Write a protein that binds this ligand. Structure first.
Ligand code: NA
Length: 54
């Protein structure tokens, strides 16, 4: 089992990370959220494959 990298609302690490991202300029925030959506897709893909291999 692999740890969920962004367990808060699917895109934040924890509350201080949320507050930090929400304080950034729009371009930076949307770039980081895009980065994280890629990380989360790969995490979820690996989780699916683990379920299928059981
Ligand atoms: Na918060």
């Amino acid at each position: 089992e692999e740890a969920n990298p962004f367990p808060l609302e699917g895109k934040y690490k924890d509350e201080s990370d949320r507050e930090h991202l929400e304080s950034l300029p729009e371009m930076e925030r949307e770039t980081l959220l895009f980065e994280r959506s890629q990380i989360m897709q790969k995490y979820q893909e690996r989780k699916l494959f683990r379920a299928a291999g059981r």
